[PDB]
């Protein structure tokens, strides 16, 4: 794996930053955001910005790999609805 340190930055009502492993599956990314924000899993609705878009797109099992392709300076930024 990578010798660098990665983070997830999550914009909820407030912003948080947590250490992450690069390339984690959606199940684990959702779970760690849910725990960090003390939100019920089912109420943890995440989105990301795709390559060259102004618009966000829902994060899911299917779109997770694309999301990781948008890491910038060792950081993946997500938005958490609400």
């Amino acid at each position: 794996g990578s010798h660098m340190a990665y983070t997830l930055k999550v914009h909820y009502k407030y912003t948080v930053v947590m250490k992450t492993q690069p390339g984690l599956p959606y199940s684990q990314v959702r779970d760690m955001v849910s725990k960090k924000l003390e939100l019920r899993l089912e109420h943890t609705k995440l989105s990301y910005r795709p390559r060259d878009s102004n618009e966000l797109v829902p994060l899911s099992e299917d779109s997770m790999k694309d999301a990781w392709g948008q890491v910038k300076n060792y950081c993946l930024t997500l938005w958490c609805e609400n």
Partner: protein
């Protein structure tokens, strides 16, 4: 004169004022979150607050645990001047003041 000083930014809506706070502990050291909360209560006399730091991108980040605090100290971009200032600065906000966070896509 041998006082160590933590500079803190205290927010009313999106503008902060500055207060320098005497701290006995070593300039090199990493505080626990609970100790920063007790420091903020002694100095501002409120507990309805959140503590934060500003990251390298310019986004304010809320501290939620001891590990977040350690990240803040680790990222700290302060050069040691003769002022005996902690190299990281603490940002204090009303806990429901969400206007200070760069959450807009």
């Amino acid at each position: 004169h041998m006082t160590n000083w933590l500079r803190v930014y205290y927010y009313e809506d999106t503008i902060s004022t500055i207060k320098d706070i005497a701290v006995e502990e070593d300039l090199s050291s990493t505080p626990l979150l609970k100790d920063l909360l007790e420091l903020t209560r002694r100095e501002f006399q409120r507990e309805d607050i959140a503590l934060n730091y500003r990251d390298a991108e310019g986004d304010l980040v809320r501290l939620l645990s001891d590990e977040d605090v350690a990240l803040m100290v680790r990222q700290a971009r302060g050069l040691p001047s003769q002022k005996r200032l902690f190299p990281w600065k603490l940002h204090i906000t009303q806990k429901d003041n969400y206007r200070v966070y760069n959450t807009m896509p």
